[PDB]
Write an enzyme that holds these catalytic residues in place. Structure first.
Site, short mmCIF file in Angstrom:
data_model
loop_
_atom_site.label_atom_id
_atom_site.label_comp_id
_atom_site.label_asym_id
_atom_site.label_seq_id
_atom_site.Cartn_x
_atom_site.Cartn_y
_atom_site.Cartn_z
N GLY A 8 -1.07 -2.36 5.71
CA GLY A 8 -0.66 -3.56 6.43
C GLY A 8 -1.58 -4.73 6.17
O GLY A 8 -2.02 -4.93 5.04
N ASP A 17 -3.86 4.52 -2.46
CA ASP A 17 -3.96 3.75 -3.71
C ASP A 17 -5.04 2.68 -3.53
O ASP A 17 -5.70 2.63 -2.50
CB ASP A 17 -2.61 3.13 -4.09
N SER A 44 2.16 -0.95 -4.55
CA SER A 44 1.04 -0.05 -4.79
C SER A 44 0.71 0.05 -6.28
O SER A 44 1.56 -0.22 -7.12
CB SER A 44 1.37 1.34 -4.25
N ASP A 53 6.52 2.07 -6.58
CA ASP A 53 6.41 0.95 -5.65
C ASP A 53 5.57 -0.17 -6.27
O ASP A 53 4.46 0.07 -6.74
CB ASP A 53 5.77 1.41 -4.33
N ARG A 71 -4.55 -0.87 -4.71
CA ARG A 71 -4.02 -2.21 -4.97
C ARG A 71 -4.04 -3.06 -3.71
O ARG A 71 -3.69 -2.59 -2.63
CB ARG A 71 -2.60 -2.14 -5.53
N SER A 95 4.06 0.37 2.15
CA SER A 95 5.26 -0.02 1.39
C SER A 95 5.77 1.09 0.47
O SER A 95 6.98 1.19 0.24
CB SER A 95 4.98 -1.29 0.57
N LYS A 131 -9.29 1.59 0.65
CA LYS A 131 -8.43 1.65 1.83
C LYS A 131 -8.79 2.81 2.76
O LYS A 131 -8.24 2.92 3.86
CB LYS A 131 -6.97 1.76 1.40
N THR A 144 0.81 -1.27 0.00
CA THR A 144 0.00 0.00 0.00
C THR A 144 0.82 1.30 0.00
O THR A 144 1.96 1.32 0.47
CB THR A 144 -0.85 0.02 1.27
#
Ligand SMILES: *[C@@](C)(CO)[C@](*)(O)[C@H](CC(C)C)NC(=O)[C@H](Cc1ccccc1)NC(=O)[C@H](CC(C)C)NC(=O)[C@H](CCc1ccccc1)NC(=O)CN1CCOCC1
Ligand SMILES: *[C@@](C)(CO)[C@](*)(O)[C@H](CC(C)C)NC(=O)[C@H](Cc1ccccc1)NC(=O)[C@H](CC(C)C)NC(=O)[C@H](CCc1ccccc1)NC(=O)CN1CCOCC1
Ligand SMILES: *[C@@](C)(CO)[C@](*)(O)[C@H](CC(C)C)NC(=O)[C@H](Cc1ccccc1)NC(=O)[C@H](CC(C)C)NC(=O)[C@H](CCc1ccccc1)NC(=O)CN1CCOCC1
Ligand SMILES: [Cl-]
Ligand SMILES: [Mg+2]
Ligand SMILES: [Mg+2]
Lengths: 204, 125, 222, 233, 222, 195, 212, 196, 195
Positions: C47, C17, C169, C166, C19, C129, C33, C1
């Site tokens: 997480g 995001d 994400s 990343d 994903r 992340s 999210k 994330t």
């Protein structure tokens, strides 16, 4: 000794134009040993269908548990549970065992009787809801199913066309997985009729 | 290691060290081999300038390489022991890997190959 | 994330995001999210997916009961305190990394919570992340006295940095704006810069392609 | 089998229209101890290549000696050592890449991440990465360590693909590098304020900048931050 | 302790036609959750109409390709410029790989080209040198996603003739270069959607009697 | 404990269970009966961890017998198998689980049909025409796939069973000292003395 | 894998499956597990693909060198022992091999040798090797007689692989048959389990466990 | 972390850096490690952020409840409550806390509480990872009964060096002054303290 | 490999060796001869690690046969056993030791006496009236302590041997598929076909 890949198996669900489909293989094994070719992984409580992959003892236990809970729901509510509501019940129940979880990969599928909207959803073993417009996959050949579904799927498929797409997604994914296969079942679900078809596939 | 090329060609195209090794054979006691219809016989000369010999223990002229193959020779007696030993070892090695005793042609080919190797190796005659 | 939070003039904005991963596999390409704790207190979660949803709903439930009990609109610090004490009690085993933000009678607020129960205060925060990609953008372009439109731009830009750089994400950008004196506006799929291109071929099969062994009508009625 | 002792952090770099820029701070960390402050981690090779090294400093110094020796060896019996047969960036990289992979294959690696930045004889920009594993890759922007996580995102906003390189000037490119170094000072716990920067241009050649500092930092907003939630004072 | 291996991600794909063969592979290079390069090619023309890719650990992949390229060079020197046939190349690669049986090249090798009858050929290798000629093979991170799709669309697996009661199979036939590229592009866009290590770009190398052509296509960069 | 087999035929269920009880390097006993009668028309064979097997079998036996007295009625094989499965399903998440695998052969008197259930220590239940636990399956399943027919008689089932035991005696590493064979049908449970 | 080879009145039958696996991933369904070493010698492959493919190929090179040097085709015993002595040198290094060197010679007659990676070498009439060996044994043993015809022997070999292919998750794809006579080996086709299973089910009346 | 508390003529001053880390990543560069447990009783937090926050929250609760019943608690009392939590939960905590407060009777007082949960009353105290580098400096430069300006300079120079050498310390230097006059917050930015 | 026995009687040495070769859950072979003739009047049986056993036995066999050819003379059983022991004693401190246990039964023609030597993989040699390797000893030694006499005939020795095999077949866990029995005496080595 990885609970989720001892018995093996797969489930996949898709949406179409005013319909939904859910399918599963029939294998139950003990690692390399194939044991049963009649082990169905899809159940239903009224018009709401539930597929469950993973550790077979938990598959059976959860089916019995959700039959238990939906029966009490119906007696008190005086109506059949809907897919959106049932999805929440599955999530609550799985997260209740957060630090001692059922080793399963459940998949909800069905049509809301009030709105008529097709609905599918997936979960991880601790109850996180994964809702989707298109498709949900689960089991030991999930990677394969993700690849098949992502390429083969298109929106607003008619029930007869949707049957072909989901069946081919399952069969070709199952054949690339050692622990899945040994027969297959597909459920086509319309607003007020449900057809169940057994597929012919390679038996190795 | 001693490297000197002892066996070499001469202007006329001869390898004198090999040819002089034949002279050593010509000096050696006579040995004969005759094969019949169902047998082979190996005859060997023993010079009679040596009396007071102990024939029980004196090395015999004919040697068994295996239970089915024999080897006699003419020339330097000390040299023959080295060939016989190598041949006996190869005989057992053949039984070990091929699970079958050597043919006479194979055993001969091996011994002959050893002899040849000493004609173009450095530091050996 | 990747998740972020940015304070501005008359409130606070958070973004995320969409994903959801399962190892290297993208499980959900458009998951939400951003969570509602109360009408004007929202939460961005990174997480363990089940944990962020479960902990946000539990505290959200208790906040509603608390609001009704006290006849008062809920405060961000109450949600913050309830979350951190819950997470601390479980010694990090509940893997929820949250950015908590909202408006209340005290004002506008922005916090972050980690799984072990530590909280941080800031004008700009990033978790997940892709937090390093996001924090790089925030550290480059953040300033004091941001407007509403400037804060949304900065927040979404920080999420985009995570989306592109990343691997954890991707997909879309969700935003929630919480301004003082106004209703909180939840902008689901605020940006959609990852639309799937037209496929080269239709894989619609001729009817009858699949071999069938048995047919039967299933009884769903009583 | 090694463990790195004295270490150097991020090396960052990018391409621009006429050449390449590379930068790295002047710190030699000893675990959490910020032990050495006068450590140059950018090493020029000729007037057309700069090798930026992160990781173990003892191994970095070994690589310095190898490059120094490479220049000497190239000059031997070579009348065109300062002309057509001068050391190219691509030659220097391939040599290091060969060494790095050979050392990992003997289970005794040079514990480093390396970026070779330079300009070829035909004017083409050269920028390529290699590390302890022998892994190699090239990209418009390249960074090691924390730079990979924080600098690359910022540098990729300037040069996102190949076609953005001609559109990027040396002024814009250097600005983005200097900004990235500031961000790393904010967020990397093994970084220093002091750093070195090097530009290799196809026209103006090699420009090596020492004793640069991170400046124009935002810290004023810290005074307003109190406690960790409920505290008001 | 020092770990000599790493994972650079990416995925590759080889398909063989009647008078041609394609070898495709995404241009993304990664470590953990970071992108190293959006365009780092890993499909190479090795001469003698042989294209090759060694996907997995890039350092080993490059070393192998480098060694095979060199093996082709010395084959010409030692055998009067003779053309190295695809079957001979395959056997040679086995010995390259198996030469390091006890410290393997961590790669999935695929080569493509034409056989000595002018027909399309694809060979695939495991890390230690086992090989097999096939019409179809996907390798790398997203191999498990792409491969079953290829079984269905290239080799027509599980597809029966409509109305024949699942008794007559769909007949095998060669695909045109146009139809193959369609399948490659759809395979990689699908893989990009559901695998995090796959994206950025797609590079395809096509091999006919006339030579080696290239085609490049953009992929999603998230 | 090691070898337990089960075959369902037209009118009966046949269970075969090895007689050996081995301990370290010693065969302590060669006449052990690895089964318990749960009810007049229901039989359970078992195999697994020492002590756990008998303790579990007798515990189930007691519960089914208690039910029979209370209701003056015999539970169906399906009902008994579901009870057994649930007990094992509870067990697997206990502090110390029962490491016991079972086969339940029964004759349903209401349906007039023989029924064979295979349940492992995890609580994994399946109804089968033929079943086995442990390494036995790796030999017998393939053999039964070939020779088994659904309309077989009890005598045909016993010959089919002999074929399995012969194969196990030929290819199994351990000496399991033959088998005790029992038949479950409409008339109840009886033991074959000469096998 | 599942591989077998048995000796009988009319020579040697050799049957193998064609599956390759990497864990639970089915890597291939079309792998050749029989090596045609020479016109009179066959080698079966169960274990590490690369090890088998590399070393049994190498074995064929050594067999060719034997007949060049000795002007005579190598014995099955000598061929098998070259391989067994080779893997014994690598014992402990981690090679994974269970093979069967099958062939006919004048002096030996039809002969089968089991050779594996921990150095075991056994002459025998019947062997089954692989992850599904037990499934193949079950069918093979229960139906095996020395006086089987060439037709019935071929089928039993085929049927035994099918049995294993069905039950063993790590066996399948297709069956490859071989018959070895005094004149040499004869190939008896590739048989896809996809079609073969249903064909056998219908015609034989077996596999009643499966939903027809 | 680098933290310290120093008694002086008019009371006591607490000092701290502002760096919070996850490995080598700085999760927060503007952290406030000086936290209030009572009007004029504060603490410096080092070790686990989660643990020290949870502890400080509980102590503040205890001292609030103490004040409701028995009036203003002593600095010693506050330190005892910290000790009780740190000692009895030593197996599950990673917290190095310095407690500092101002009474009118007792003036400025400093108690340090290391990992074990022991209590040590001192004229001044230093703690955290970066404190190791300034034992020499602080011992040579500390005097009793310093002025406010002298004590601020002492803390500033000390933490400046701790920050310079410790990678786990950095950002701004926060300080809190505790005297009869009241509570004063001070901040010092890199541009000032780095070039000392 | 598992069971190897040896009994020295008045005028001969009798070796009994199990026929089973087992690998995993499969008995691959039930007619394996775990012995090699080293010389006309010397026989060595063996048991231990797979591959090592035969490789070692054949290596010794080759060396003794080489000696016989070279000297045109048969080495005494004592001499052969000492050679074998030294080879194993070297082996145990090698990079990879031979994990092979052997029994050497021989008839010394100069002494006119049968001789039985037991040597383990460490190189531990002992001359014995009766010997065994592995778990076999735990049953047979006590039995032979009771029934063995030094003046027994070959026929009495074979009956004594039958008694051992019967006991092993009763109490051993694994099926070792009977034994091949060989007799070593003044007339050389011969095999008992019906046992
Ligand atoms: C970015 C994308 C990366 O973290 C974000 O932080 C998101 C947060 C959003 C989705 C709320 N994180 C994830 O997507 C998260 C990453 C992750 C994975 C595993 C552990 C921790 C974090 N993914 C998940 O939580 C997925 C969500 C799925 C699609 C429902 N869940 C899983 O991967 C679960 C993890 C469950 C778990 C158990 C015990 C401790 C921690 C987590 N794993 C599986 O389902 C794997 N397996 C599948 C086969 O069946 C058995 C379970
Ligand atoms: C049955 C079918 C399986 O039991 C047979 O035994 C067959 C025999 C045939 C192929 C001759 N055996 C296998 O299929 C064999 C199983 C196996 C694997 C590894 C060790 C021992 C046995 N499979 C293989 O050898 C596969 C071949 C296919 C083409 C992938 N190869 C691998 O598993 C390779 C190499 C294994 C290896 C051995 C020694 C050192 C290093 C590696 N490994 C991988 O491909 C790894 N894997 C691929 C997917 O990406 C993740 C890593
Ligand atoms: C200096 C920095 C060192 O003494 C100071 O003491 C400060 C104290 C202030 C902030 C109150 N200490 C820290 O910043 C502290 C250092 C630390 C780290 C680990 C254990 C104890 C102390 N850092 C933290 O507490 C961070 C703060 C978060 C990022 C907001 N937390 C972590 O690093 C967590 C804590 C886990 C933990 C370990 C042991 C005891 C209690 C909690 N660690 C991780 O998340 C580890 N992480 C896993 C993913 O990979 C990266 C590392
Ligand atoms: Cl804090
Ligand atoms: Mg199978
Ligand atoms: Mg991304």
């Amino acid at each position: 000794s990885d609970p989720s890949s001892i018995n093996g198996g797969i489930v996949v669900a898709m949406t179409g134009k005013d319909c939904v489909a859910i399918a599963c293989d029939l294998r139950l094994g003990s690692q390399s040993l194939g044991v049963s070719n009649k082990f169905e992984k899809i159940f239903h409580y009224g018009h709401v269908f539930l597929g469950i992959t993973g550790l077979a003892t938990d598959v059976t236990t959860l089916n019995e548990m959700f039959r238990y809970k939906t029966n009490l729901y119906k007696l008190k509510e005086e109506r059949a549970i809907e897919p959106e509501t049932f999805t929440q019940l599955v999530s609550s129940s799985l997260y209740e065992r957060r630090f001692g979880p059922y080793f399963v990969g459940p998949v909800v599928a069905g049509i809301n009787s009030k709105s008529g909207k097709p609905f599918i959803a997936g979960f991880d073993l601790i109850g996180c809801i994964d809702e989707a417009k298109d498709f949900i996959v689960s089991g030991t050949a999930s990677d394969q199913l993700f690849g098949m579904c992502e390429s083969l799927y298109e929106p607003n498929l008619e029930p007869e066309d949707l049957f072909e797409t989901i069946s081919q997604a399952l069969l070709n994914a199952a054949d690339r997985d050692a622990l899945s296969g040994w027969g297959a079942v597909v459920y086509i679900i319309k607003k007020d009729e449900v057809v169940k078809r057994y597929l012919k596939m390679r038996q190795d | 290691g001693y490297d000197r090329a002892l066996s070499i060609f001469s202007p006329d195209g001869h390898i004198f060290q090999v040819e002089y090794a034949l002279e050593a054979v010509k000096r050696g006691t006579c040995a004969v081999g005759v094969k019949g219809k169902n047998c082979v016989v190996l005859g060997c000369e023993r010079r009679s300038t040596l009396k007071l010999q102990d024939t029980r223990i004196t090395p015999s002229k004919v040697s068994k390489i295996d239970s089915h193959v024999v080897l006699s020779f003419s020339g330097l007696n000390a040299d023959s022991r080295i060939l016989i030993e190598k041949a006996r070892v190869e005989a057992q090695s053949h039984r070990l890997t091929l699970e079958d005793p050597v043919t006479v042609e194979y055993l001969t080919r091996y011994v002959a190959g050893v002899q040849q190797r000493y004609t173009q190796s450095g530091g050996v005659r | 994330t990747t998740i972020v939070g940015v304070k501005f003039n008359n409130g606070v904005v958070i973004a995320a995001d969409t994903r959801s991963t399962q190892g290297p596999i993208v499980a959900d390409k458009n998951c939400a999210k951003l969570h509602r704790i109360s009408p004007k207190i929202w939460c961005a979660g990174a997480g363990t997916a089940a944990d962020t949803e479960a902990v946000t709903q539990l505290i959200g439930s208790n906040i509603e009961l608390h609001s009704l009990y006290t006849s008062r609109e809920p405060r961000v610090v109450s949600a913050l305190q309830m979350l951190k004490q819950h997470l601390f009690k479980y010694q990090g085993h509940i893997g929820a990394y949250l950015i908590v933000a909202g408006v209340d009678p005290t004002g506008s607020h922005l916090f972050s919570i980690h799984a072990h129960g530590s909280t941080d205060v800031g004008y700009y925060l990033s978790l997940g992340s892709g937090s390093l990609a996001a924090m790089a953008v925030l550290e480059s372009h953040w300033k004091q006295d941001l407007t509403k439109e400037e804060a949304i731009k900065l927040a979404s830009d920080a999420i985009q940095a995570g989306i592109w750089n990343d691997l954890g994400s991707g997909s879309n950008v969700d935003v929630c704006v919480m301004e003082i004196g106004k209703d909180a506006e939840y902008l689901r799929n605020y940006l959609t810069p990852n639309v799937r291109e037209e496929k080269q071929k239709s894989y619609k099969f001729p009817r009858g392609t699949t071999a069938v062994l048995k047919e039967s009508i299933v009884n769903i009625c009583d | 089998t090694q463990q790195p002792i004295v270490t150097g952090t991020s090396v960052i770099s990018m391409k621009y229209d006429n050449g390449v820029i590379i930068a790295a701070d002047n710190l030699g960390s000893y675990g959490s101890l910020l032990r050495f402050n006068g450590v140059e981690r950018l090493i020029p090779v000729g007037d057309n290549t700069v090798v930026g090294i992160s990781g173990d400093i003892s191994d970095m110094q070994h690589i310095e000696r190898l490059l120094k020796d490479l220049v000497t060896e190239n000059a031997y019996d070579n009348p065109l050592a300062d002309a057509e047969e001068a050391l190219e960036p691509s030659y220097i990289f391939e040599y290091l890449a060969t060494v790095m992979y050979q050392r990992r294959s003997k289970m005794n690696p040079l514990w480093n991440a390396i970026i070779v930045a330079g300009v070829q004889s035909n004017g083409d920009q050269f920028l390529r990465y290699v590390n302890l594993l022998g892994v190699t890759y090239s990209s418009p922007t390249l960074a090691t360590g924390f730079g990979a996580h924080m600098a690359n995102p910022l540098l990729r906003k300037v040069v996102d693909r190949e076609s953005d390189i001609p559109k990027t000037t040396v002024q814009v490119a250097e600005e983005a590098i200097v900004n990235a170094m500031r961000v790393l000072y904010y967020r990397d716990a093994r970084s220093s304020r002091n750093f070195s920067l090097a530009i290799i241009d196809k026209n103006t050649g090699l420009t090596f900048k020492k004793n640069l500092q991170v400046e124009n930092m935002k810290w004023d907003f810290a005074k307003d931050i109190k406690g960790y939630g409920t505290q008001k004072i | 302790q020092f770990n000599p291996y790493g994972d650079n991600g990416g995925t590759i794909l080889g398909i063989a036609g009647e008078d041609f063969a394609v070898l495709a592979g995404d241009t993304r290079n990664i470590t953990d959750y970071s992108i190293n390069s959006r365009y780092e090619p890993k499909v190479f023309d090795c001469g003698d109409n042989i294209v090759m890719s060694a996907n997995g650990f890039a350092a080993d992949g490059d070393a192998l390709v480098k060694r095979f390229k060199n093996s082709v060079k010395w084959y010409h020197f030692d055998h009067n410029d003779k053309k190295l046939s695809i079957n001979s190349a395959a056997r040679n690669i086995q010995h390259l790989l198996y030469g390091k049986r006890f410290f393997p090249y961590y790669v999935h090798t695929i080569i493509a080209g034409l056989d000595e009858d002018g027909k399309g050929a694809v060979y695939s290798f495991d890390p230690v040198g086992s090989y097999e000629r096939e019409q179809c093979r996907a390798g790398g991170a997203a191999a498990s996603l792409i491969m079953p799709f290829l079984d269905n669309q290239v080799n027509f697996k599980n597809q029966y003739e409509p109305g024949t009661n699942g008794k007559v199979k769909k007949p095998l036939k060669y695909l045109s270069v146009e139809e193959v590229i369609k399948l490659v592009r759809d395979s990689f866009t699908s893989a990009t959607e559901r695998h995090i290590q796959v994206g950025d770009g797609l590079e395809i190398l096509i091999v006919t009697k006339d030579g080696v052509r290239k085609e490049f296509y953009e992929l999603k960069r998230d | 404990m090691d070898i337990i087999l089960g075959i369902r035929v037209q009118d009966s269920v046949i269970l075969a269970s090895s007689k050996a009880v081995t301990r370290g390097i010693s065969v302590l006993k060669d006449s052990d009966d690895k089964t318990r009668q749960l009810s007049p028309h229901t039989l359970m064979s078992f195999a697994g961890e020492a002590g756990d097997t008998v303790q579990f079998a007798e515990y189930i036996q007691a519960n089914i017998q208690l039910y029979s007295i209370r209701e003056d009625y015999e539970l169906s094989p399906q009902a008994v198998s579901s009870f057994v499965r649930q007990e094992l399903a509870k067990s697997i998440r206990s502090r110390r689980p029962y490491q016991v695998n079972v086969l339940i052969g029964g004759y349903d008197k209401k349906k007039n049909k023989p029924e064979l259930y295979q349940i492992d220590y995890l609580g994994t239940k399946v109804e089968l025409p033929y079943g086995a636990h442990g390494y036995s399956g790796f030999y017998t399943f393939s053999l039964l796939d070939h020779h088994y027919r659904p309309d077989m008689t009890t005598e045909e089932g016993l010959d089919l069973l002999k074929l399995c035991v012969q194969e196990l005696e030929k290819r199994m590493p351990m000496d399991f000292k033959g088998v005790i064979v029992k038949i479950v049908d409409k008339d109840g449970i009886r033991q074959v003395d000469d096998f | 894998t599942t591989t077998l080879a048995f000796r009988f009145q009319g020579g040697i039958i050799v049957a193998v499956d064609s599956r390759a696996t990497a864990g639970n991933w089915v890597a291939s369904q079309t792998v050749k597990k029989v090596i045609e070493i020479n016109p009179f010698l066959l080698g079966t492959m169960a274990g590490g693909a690369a090890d088998f493919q590399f070393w049994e190929t190498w074995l064929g090179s050594q067999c060719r060198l034997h007949e060049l040097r000795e002007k005579e085709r190598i014995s099955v015993a000598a061929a098998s022992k070259i391989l067994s002595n080779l893997v014994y040198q690598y014992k402990g290094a981690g090679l994974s091999m269970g093979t069967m060197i099958c062939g006919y010679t004048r002096k030996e007659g039809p002969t089968i040798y089991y050779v594996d990676s921990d150095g075991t070498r056994l002459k025998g009439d019947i062997f089954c090797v692989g992850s599904g060996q037990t499934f193949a044994y079950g069918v093979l043993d229960s139906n095996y007689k020395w006086d089987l015809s060439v037709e019935d022997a071929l089928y039993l070999g085929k049927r035994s692989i099918l049995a294993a292919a069905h039950r063993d998750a790590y066996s399948g794809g297709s069956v490859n048959l071989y018959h070895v006579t005094e004149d040499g080996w004869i190939y008896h086709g590739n048989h896809d389990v996809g079609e073969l299973f249903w064909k056998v089910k219908e015609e034989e009346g077996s596999f009643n466990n499966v939903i027809g | 972390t680098s933290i310290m508390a120093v008694t002086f003529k008019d009371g006591v001053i607490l000092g701290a850096d502002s760096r919070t880390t996850t490995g080598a990543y700085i999760a927060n560069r503007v952290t406030d490690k000086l936290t209030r447990v009572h009007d004029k009783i504060w603490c410096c937090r080092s070790g686990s952020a989660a643990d020290t926050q949870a502890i400080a929250d509980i102590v503040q609760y205890h001292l609030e409840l103490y004040t409701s019943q028995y009036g203003t608690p002593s600095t010693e009392t506050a330190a005892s409550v910290f000790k009780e939590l740190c000692y009895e939960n030593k197996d599950n905590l990673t917290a190095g806390i310095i407690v500092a407060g101002y009474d009118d009777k007792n003036k400025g007082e400093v108690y340090t509480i290391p990992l074990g949960g022991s209590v040590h009353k001192l004229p001044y105290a230093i703690a955290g990872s970066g404190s190791t580098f300034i034992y020499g400096y602080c011992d040579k430069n500390f005097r009793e009964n310093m002025s406010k300006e002298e004590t601020v300079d002492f803390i500033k120079h000390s933490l400046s060096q701790a920050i310079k050498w410790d990678g786990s310390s950095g950002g701004v230097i926060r300080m809190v002054v505790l005297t009869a006059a009241g509570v004063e917050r001070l901040i010092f930015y890199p541009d000032e303290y780095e070039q000392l």
